[PDB]
Ligand binder design. Structure first.
Ligand code: HFF
Ligand code: HFF
Ligand code: NAG
Ligand code: NAG
Ligand code: NAG
Ligand code: NAG
Ligand code: NAG
Ligand code: ZN
Ligand code: ZN
Lengths: 276, 277
């Protein structure tokens, strides 16, 4: 009972249909404002790393609202502190994009929309033993936002689609909800190497789909990875679920939320990080 | 005399006109081959840092072959080891570009040319007390190569030209050689933050202009910084010097050299770096 493009179930209705927590005042996405952010030199380079003993397969699903890569358990990790001790475990990666190249991202940077934003979703394994235990609990989640920008001149091997192994060619008009397919694994360490993993915005916010749970540690990298126009078009061939009005999947992004709506009882701060 | 576009003085002649050292077997630029390169996990993230006590002015000149930013002494530094103890001191930054958007860089990455390559030139202050001591001596220099790529959709603030402060507007048809102008300082730390400073090729090579001295420790970052078509055409507004056949400055790049020409007496290796995973 939610959508992006059906005005009966669309993002303007979520605050009424999912008051816990889409009516809250720690919502995502936000406009990432360079001038109205606080630099915190203690925020360290982000590392993504794999358990080389893991052999289980990766899948991708058209879930009717996005293309969602589902990682197997105990395989991909994030470190924010330079220690490789499995504090954050990656669950899934999904995508938000536009009907057109001038929009698509959930977050903006100084009001600018990117054509594609990837969300790498992890749970705080340091505290919570499973995703199902973490997803609804305080401080459960950490999401990385990866901006993508379109370029006319580039070798395949230097695009984000190299790190995605082209989603093993699975993206087409017949990849219909709720189908999933097995795909070659995503090299998330290569993906992170395509941008500056020290240069990012950081804040406490929410899931950007219902029920908009206010338990997400957000990190949004300022530098985009690079893709081609042919590559963004592979996402736009996907069909939306039947609860949507638009036929082809696109404009699957939530509208911008305020950092501090007027009813907040404790203001949050937007932080930024850069290298030593 | 040398040039890029006069066939009498152009790059195919340098090996004869400047045999010391344009006839050498450790020449630059090279094709940076991802597959035929040795990953060395010991090569650390590059840092660029400023002496915040320096107040001296930056200038830029059209030297007849490039646009060259001349930094004041004791101002901008490179660290390859995480220590901020002034081992490498930056002297200047210049640029290589194309008549068209599909060429211009001196290095290639797996055969691919970028529209614009910037060269941040430093000397090994750790060993040599001045640029003029280091520039002609063994192991004297370290150059950073910064690839740039054109995007259609971007804010000024996320382009390389934010770090450059648009070179204070000096890139135009009236910026004739050998004119120099005072410019706002270049934020080289911001520039480096626009790419991944842990992801680079590394090798021992040469200056890419005569006399091609084989005393350069090369670092070429794999990820490009971003510019617009409007910004690349600003460089194309500069006039070449009177040594050149072409009027407008462009195609001011040296042809690709082999890592190991047939006559080499000791093969060099191309190294690659990536972030502590
Ligand atoms: N757009 S975003 O990045 O803000 C974002 C929005 C919304 C979500 C949805 C989170 N749900 C997700 S990621 N779910 C649902 C679930 O109940 N379980 C619990 C069961 C289970 C078991 C193994 C592995 C995974 C799971 C997750 C999957 C995640 C991320
Ligand atoms: N294309 S490249 O990156 O391989 C490359 C090619 C050629 C060079 C030019 C080297 N010359 C350069 S960088 N010169 C010449 C000189 O007489 N002195 C000595 C005096 C002096 C004093 C202060 C500050 C600078 C200097 C340099 C400037 C540098 C770099
Ligand atoms: C830190 C972590 O999750 N390590 C896992 C280990 O528990 C598992 O038994 C193995 C084989 O799948 O892969 C690795
Ligand atoms: C993760 C998931 O839902 N996997 C499904 C599987 O259960 C189903 O049997 C198969 C073919 O329909 O497609 C896939
Ligand atoms: C702020 C600054 O120094 N330089 C300007 C910038 O404001 C302007 O939008 C752009 C295009 O004309 O060129 C540069
Ligand atoms: C990527 O996948 C698409 C199908 O989604 C295919 O048409 C395209 O050629 C693929 N490109 C590769 C493997 O480079
Ligand atoms: C920093 O600048 C000051 C004054 O400009 C100078 O005296 C000092 O030597 C510089 N530091 C270094 C390490 O070069
Ligand atoms: Zn998302
Ligand atoms: Zn140069």
């Amino acid at each position: 009972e939610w959508s992006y493009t059906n005005i009966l179930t669309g993002p303007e209705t979520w605050h009424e249909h999912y008051k816990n927590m889409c009516s809250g005042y720690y919502q995502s996405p936000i406009d990432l404002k360079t001038d109205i952010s606080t630099l915190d030199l203690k925020l360290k380079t982000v590392i993504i790393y794999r358990n080389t003993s893991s052999t289980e397969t990766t899948t991708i699903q058209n879930n009717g609202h996005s293309a969602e890569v589902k990682f197997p358990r105990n395989t991909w990790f994030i470190s924010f502190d330079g220690i490789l001790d499995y504090k954050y475990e990656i669950i899934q990666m999904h995508f938000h994009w536009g009907n057109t190249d001038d929009r698509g991202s959930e977050h903006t940077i100084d009001g600018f929309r990117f054509p594609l934003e990837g969300h790498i979703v992890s749970f705080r394994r340091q505290m919570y033993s499973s995703p199902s235990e973490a997803i609804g609990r305080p401080g459960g989640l950490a999401v990385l936002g990866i901006m993508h920008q379109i370029v006319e001149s580039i070798k395949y091997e230097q695009t984000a689609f190299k790190a995605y192994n082209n989603f093993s060619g699975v993206l087409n008009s017949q990849f219909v909800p709720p189908n999933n397919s097995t795909i070659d694994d995503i090299n998330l360490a290569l993906l992170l190497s395509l941008l500056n993993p020290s240069r990012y915005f950081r804040y406490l916010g929410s899931l950007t789909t219902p029920p908009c749970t206010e338990n997400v540690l957000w990190t949004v990298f300022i530098d985009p990875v690079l893709i081609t126009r042919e590559q963004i078009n592979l996402f736009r061939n996907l069909p939306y679920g039947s609860n949507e009005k638009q036929t082809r999947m696109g404009d699957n992004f939530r509208p911008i939320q305020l950092l501090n709506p007027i009813d907040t009882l404790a203001s949050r701060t937007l932080y930024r990080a850069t290298a030593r």
